[PDB]
Amino acid sequence: SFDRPEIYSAPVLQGESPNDDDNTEIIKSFKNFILEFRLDSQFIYRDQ
Amino acid sequence: LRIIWGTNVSIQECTTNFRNFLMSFKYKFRKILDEREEFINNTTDEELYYIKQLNEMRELGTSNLNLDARNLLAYKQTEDLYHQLLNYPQEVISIMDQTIKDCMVSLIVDNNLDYDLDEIETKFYKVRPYNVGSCKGMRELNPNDIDKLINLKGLVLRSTPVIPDMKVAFFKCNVCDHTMAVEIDRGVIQEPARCERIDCNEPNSMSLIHNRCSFADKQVIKLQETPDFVPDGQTPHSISLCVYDELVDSCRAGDRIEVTGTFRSIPIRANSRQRVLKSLYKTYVDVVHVK
Amino acid sequence: SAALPSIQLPVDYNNLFNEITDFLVTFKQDKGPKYMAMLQKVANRELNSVIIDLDDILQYQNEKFLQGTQADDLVSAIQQNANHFTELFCRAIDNNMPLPTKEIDYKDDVLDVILNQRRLRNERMLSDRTNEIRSENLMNDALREVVEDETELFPPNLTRRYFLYFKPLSQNCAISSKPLSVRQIKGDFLGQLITVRGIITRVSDVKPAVEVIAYTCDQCGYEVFQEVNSRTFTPLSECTSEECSQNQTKGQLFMSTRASKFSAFQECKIQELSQQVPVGHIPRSLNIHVNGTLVRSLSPGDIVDVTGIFLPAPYTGFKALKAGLLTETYLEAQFVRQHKKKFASFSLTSDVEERVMELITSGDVYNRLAKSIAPEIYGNLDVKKALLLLLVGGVDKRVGDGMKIRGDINVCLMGDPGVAKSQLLKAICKISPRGVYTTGKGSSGVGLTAAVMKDPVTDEMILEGGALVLADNGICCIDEFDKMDESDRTAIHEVMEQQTISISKAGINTTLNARTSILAAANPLYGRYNPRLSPLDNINLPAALLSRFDILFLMLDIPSRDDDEKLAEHVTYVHMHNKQPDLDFTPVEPSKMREYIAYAKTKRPVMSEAVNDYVVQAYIRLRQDSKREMDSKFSFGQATPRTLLGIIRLSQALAKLRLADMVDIDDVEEALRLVRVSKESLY
Amino acid sequence: RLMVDRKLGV
Ligand SMILES: Nc1ncnc2c1ncn2[C@@H]1O[C@H](COP(=O)(O)OP(=O)(O)O)[C@@H](O)[C@H]1O
Ligand code: BEF
Ligand SMILES: [Mg+2]
Ligand SMILES: [Zn+2]
Ligand SMILES: [Zn+2]
Structure with missing residues (x-):
């Protein structure tokens, strides 16, 4: 007669440095590429 | 800073x-x-x-x-x-x-x-x-006092034999004889999933050698407290000190000692089903000094 | 949606959440809001427990309805489903928590500094994410929403220090008002907020119960929390951190006990009062769960009205007996009301001050408090005075050399059968905050008990003793003292003369603490007193044991034309009207008497030089008198230094009765009078 | 390894 127990999480301290091959770093690079690519001084991908 | x-x-x-x-x-x-x-x-x-x-x-x-x-x-x-x-x-x-x-x-x-x-x-x-x-006794130590220095005085009732405590494991690779020594950190030993050598890789090549590991002394001492203050209708309580290294075999039964150390709490495994721990933690005291 | 159907219910949790928030913010009846001030005190790390007075909620509802505004029945909803409203109140409080005005000063509890660190860290994460998303340059409300959705904060469950408890409605103001026996706590009451009235039997010792075990992944630098709401849990071994989860690199966790959340835990197992048991049955017990700051509030042999939530738990009995989703129950304690106030909890506030003033200003405190003990008993004034002195108790001295003096009185009530001896013991049991009524030979066959059983909740062996340890700092009313076997008499030797019990049986080599005042009542040898035989033979108590008793009344039964007709009139009137006959004085009810006795126990009077000379001369004269009649027909025993100590103890108790810090000469005179007239009925 | 900034508290 009990509810399922949750499992939280939280970042606390800087662990080992994120490698380039790390998926999160790939996603960050991709997001920055989407948000900062400039052609003819225009954010083509952001506006698209 | x-x-x-x-x-x-x-x-x-x-x-x-x-x-x-x-x-x-x-x-x-x-x-x-x-x-x-x-x-x-x-x-x-x-x-x-x-x-x-x-x-x-x-x-x-x-x-x-x-x-x-x-x-x-x-x-x-x-x-x-x-x-x-x-x-x-x-x-x-x-x-x-x-x-x-x-x-x-x-x-x-x-x-x-x-x-x-x-x-x-x-x-x-x-x-x-x-x-x-x-001293404050042991009936008065709330769970917020885990991992703090406490002062206890009482009579040493019983003293267990010396219990070896593993410090360095000695896993041996069967195939290429890659004998790596694993130190214990926070009471945890991590097994190499495969052979740590790159040329040789065999997960089943590991077979821990019990006898060639390096151990350390551990003695558990049963101390019955005699607190300076006793609440109404409180029978004497027994607490389990845990000495280490040189303090082992120092306190004999019947010695009236005053001990200071770290008030610890450790989960106790419900042996009904293996690797399942009870939610009530057992309390013991690591010992740093004995007077 | 077909697998899990739906039901419409009269409760709307959003409207009730709004009502809860409004009640917390705008309740002033008890300058500022009561609960806002309490929350401010909590924020400054003063109070660790928030007591939600349901009477306040009822008054809030009455105010809202009286002015015409429609307010939903919050009190009824709380009573019907108490568990959910605990979290509702907790979240409402967590929203309205003010900020501290006194920071960490190196002397604060480690829990507080950890909570502050977590709060600052999650605030820093939130602000940093806000800054990044703002700098991306793609209203601040949308920004707040996106950053709070995209960040993994320490949950508010791990940043609260206070504990939440509900106080049931007072019966006079008004279900929780009516206390219930364990028998009446049926399966219909689960989830409600009920009040169970009973006597606490077996309280375990405080042990840490883990609520949210905390781990650390060294590789990814995260902290992962695993909530636990079961008697047993499974530890974690693989990282659950989202970023570390997507990453295929191996991660290992480690327990961090300092980071984990613990709650002080205790189990009490209350039983039924003897009055509640129906005819022919035996009392049955009910488990009580105590969490947070309520621990150590319940002790064995306590008459209490525990109010709590009657939650169920999954069954742990035999599978054969389990036929369905059988569940075992318990009562999560929320409020504890001691039916008899302990002496050690006394406090001189205005509430007790006014009534104490009322008693003393009217005067005649000694006679009133003596007569108020069992008013249905007639004519036994001197023994009532002795029992009152027993209740007050003397002063115990502790010389620097380690010498200790008892400072407690022991009264023996010898007498012919039918002189209401056993009634006075029961009256004392009903007056004293702690006490045990042992009797006979078979009953309480071991007043000293060398019982070392196992604690059901914690595997460590606990030591259990007889009534003597339960009667610590109390009165162990012993009945049928002469019929008690020799082993218990030998144990009571030490218990009376010292305050300890020394045990060296198999498995136990300890020394229990029993600072108990023994009150006994036994018939003389050969039933009634035989004036042919010497008094020391009728009593049949060895001189070692008899010396321990400060006062040993004889209470002989002798027929009389006048006294017996007065006694008959008294008893017949008591049977006609269930009241004390005379109208000269109104008796003091046991609550007021107990309050005054506690106040008197606070004082520690001291003797005087002239008083000391008087006492010394009296002791010398008593010793000479004992030597003279060492073999006369009235040899009540040779005087011993314990007689001097008893004189001192009685004088100190009498001084306490007048609320004085200085022993008076008339007090010593009265103590001598009582000691002498304890044997006056012998003639 | 467990080192963090001192602005947390005093
Ligand atoms: N002085 C008295 N006042 C009131 N009732 C009395 C008195 N003496 C005897 N009784 C009655 O006589 C009975 C004896 O009670 P109990 O206390 O058991 O006697 P004991 O223990 O002295 O043998 C009870 O019913 C009690 O009410
Ligand atoms: F006959 Be009575 F209980 F001393
Ligand atoms: Mg009797
Ligand atoms: Zn190898
Ligand atoms: Zn991880």
């Missing part, structure tokens, strides 16, 4: 304060805190207590220093270090050990003593505090 997470301790500041206390402690300060200034001695109070103690430590060659926490309370500059020591046993104790080693080697260097520093830097020094406040 740079306080540790989950604590109020800064390594640099605490080391500075402990060195300051070591350099400039005189027993007259404890006499002042004891309001016993009429008993102030001209000889002993003038002399520097811990500097002298560290000296005879150097000549005799011992590796353990016994610190009275009320002396820390006596020194104004280290009044905060006292509370830091109570609230954070392990960190502050390690800080003290490093500072003791530093002070030993510095004192040898400054006087340019002929005594070689080979032994000193290789040795490991330990600080054993005591006289850390009152």
